[PDB]
Structure 1
C-alpha cells in the first residue's frame, strides 16, 4: 500500500555537510540566496496540437502542460458549471528511477494540489463554461507532464498549469478561458534549521519537510500543502508563510511578464 519510499536518491554526506555551511552565510550552492527562486522560463504554445500549452523550465525542472477542451454533460453535482480535470504524470523519462504505468501517489498528489489551488482560488470561473444549463458544457482537460525532476516540481507544475490555461484558445476561435487572475505556488523547505525557497533536488533529499503556499494577486492564501517525512515547528510554519508571501509578489510579476500580463 502507501509505503515509505524504498529507493531513494542517496545524497553524499559531504554534499550536505557543506550545503549547511553555505546556508550559514546565506548563500546556496548554485549561488542564489535562501529566498531566491530558480531562473524561470515559460514557452507558450510549445505543444502545437494543444488548445493551450506551456513549457516551463524552472532551474533544471522541466514541466509541460497542455489543455484539451470538449463538450460534455455537467454532473448531478451542480449543472451550472463546466469541468476541470487535472492529470499530472512523472514520465519514466524525467528521472532515472521512474517507472511506466498509472499515476503513482506523488503524481496524484501533485494533480490534486494543483486542482484545488485552481478551483478554490476561483482562478478559473467554471460557471461561465456553461453552454446551456444542465445540458452541454465545456470540459477543461489539463494534463501536466513532468519531463525533468530537478526539485520543487509542485511550483513548476502550477506555473505551467496557469500558463497553459491563459494560452488556451476556445473554438466554435471564440476566446480565452474565463480566467479571473493568475495563481502562484511557493514551496518553502525546512532544511536543518533553515527555511529555503524553491528547493532543488539535493535540497529535497536533505530536507526535513516542505510546505507549499498558494497566493492570488491580492496576496490571499488559497492553498497550503505540507510534504515530507519530517515535522516543522509552529514558528517554522508562521515564518514560512511570511517568506512565501514576500516571494509571491516577485513571482506573480515574472509570471505576468511571461503571460503577456
Structure 2
C-alpha cells in the first residue's frame, strides 16, 4: 500500500524521511581523492553517490574544426548501484544520462574547446570524463553534473611544446595549468505527482511511483542550459517559475559549497 502511505505524508506537507517538500538532503563532496587521474571528484547526496574521473589525452581533431579539443563524457550505472541493472553493456538510463551530460557540456559552454588546441590540424586534447554511480537512491543527474563540474575544476593539465627539428611534442609534467571554466551549471530535479504536486530531489521510490519527472539546469547569470521534461502529467508556467526560483537557490548553495572546498585545499 505504498502510494497511499505516501499521500498521507504529502498532505501533511512532509515526507516519510523528514524533508519539508522543497529541501534536499545532506550534500557533500571530496576533491583530489585520486592520483592516477588528472581530475577526481566524489559527490554524495545522503545515500546517492557519484564519482567522476577525468583523464587527459592527445588526439587529432576533425576536418570541420581543427581547433576543438574533445570532451567525451560517459556515465556508468554498474549493477552494484542497484539491482535494476545487470552485468553487460550499458542500458537506457546510462545512455540518456550520457547524452544529457553532453548536451550540457555543449550548451552551457562551461569550457572553450579552442582552449584545448596545441597545434591545430595536428594535435588537440581529449578530456575523457568518466562518471560512475555507486548508489542510485535517486536524482542521479544533479549528482552527475555537480561531480563533473567539481572534477573539471580540479583538473590541472601539463604544458606541451613542439620541436621543429624532431617534429614532435614534449610534455612538462612538473609545470601545469588549471582549466578555465566560465559558467557553473547546476541541475535541480523535480518529481510531479498526479497534477500539481512537485517535490524536489526525489529519491528512488518517489521516482518509481511518480507520474512525471523534470530537471532544470540554471547557470549563474540567470539563464538556463536545459529543461529536461520527459513525459508527465502536464505543467503550466505557474508550476514552472517556482521551480526556476528554487533552482537559482540551489545554484547559490552548491556554488558556495564548492568554493569553500576548493579553498579548503
SS in 1 for 2:84: coil
What corresponds to 2:71 in structure 1? Answer: 84
Query: Per the alignment, in what secondary structure is the counterpart of residue 103 of structure 1?
Result: coil
Cα deviations by residue, 1:195-218 (Å, 9 ceiling, x for unpaired):
111111121111111111111111
Distance 1:259 1:25, change over 3 A: farther
1:53 corresponds to which residue? Answer: 40
Q: Evaluate the alpha carbon distance shift between residue 260 and residue 214 of structure 1 in structure 2; reply closer, same or farther with a 3 A threshold.
A: farther
Alpha-carbon displacement from aligned partner over 1:5-29 (angstroms, at most 9, x marks no partner) = xxxxxxxx2x321222222232222
Paired residue total: 247
Unaligned runs of 5+ in 1: 1-12
Do the aligned residues in 1 keep the contact of 2:191 with 2:202 (CA within 8 Å)? Answer: yes
Residue by residue, what CA displacement relative to the aligned partner does 1:100-152 show, whole Å, maximum 9, x if unpaired? 22221111111111111122111112111110122211110000001111101
Deviation at residue 251 of structure 1 after TM alignment: 3.0
RMSD: 1.8
1:75 aligns with 2:85: no
Tell me the equivalent position of 1:5. none
**What TM-score results when the alignment is normalised by the length of structure 2?**
0.87
Whether the aligned pair in 1 keeps the contact of 2:77 and 2:134 (CA below 8 Å) is yes
Deviations 1:153-195 (A, max 9, x none): 1111111111111111212341122311322111111023311
Maintained 8 Å contact 1:118/1:183: no
Which structure is larger by alpha-carbon Rg, 1 or 2? 2
Within the candidate set 30, 46, 57, 2:17 is matched to 30
Whether 1:222 and 2:209 are equivalent positions in the alignment is: no
**8 Å contact 1:185–1:214 — kept in the other structure?**
yes
Task: Give the match's secondary structure for 2:28.
Answer: strand
Aligned to 2:205: 202
Quote the offset at 1:43 in angstroms. 0.8
**Superposed displacement of residue 257, structure 1:** 2.5
Q: C-alpha offsets along residues 32-76 of structure 1, whole Å, 9 cap, x if unaligned?
A: 221112111101122321111111111211111101101111112
Checking the alignment, whether the CA contact within 8 Å between 1:144 and 1:161 is kept in structure 2 is: yes
Cross-structure match for 1:65? 52
> Could you tell me how far apart the structure 1 residues matched to 2:60 and 2:263 are?
33
Work out which of the residue numbers 141, 166, 184 in structure 2 matches 1:154.
141
Partners of 1:54 and 1:118 in 2: CA distance? 17
Contact 1:155–1:184 (8 Å) recurs in 2: yes
Equivalent-residue separation in structure 2 for 1:60 and 1:77 (angstroms)? 44
User: How do 1:90-239 and structure 2 match up within 5 A?
Assistant: 90-171=77-158, 172=171, 173-192=175-194, 193-227=196-230, 230-235=232-237, 236-239=239-242
**TM-score, normalised relative to structure 1:** 0.88
TM-fit CA distance, 1:238: 4.4
Aligned partners of 2:199, 2:210: CA distance in 1, in Å? 9
Q: Which moved more, 1:181-190 or 1:149-158?
A: 181-190
Residue 244 of structure 1 corresponds to 247
Provide the C-alpha distance between the structure 2 equivalents of 1:222 and 1:255, rounded to a whole number of angstroms. 20
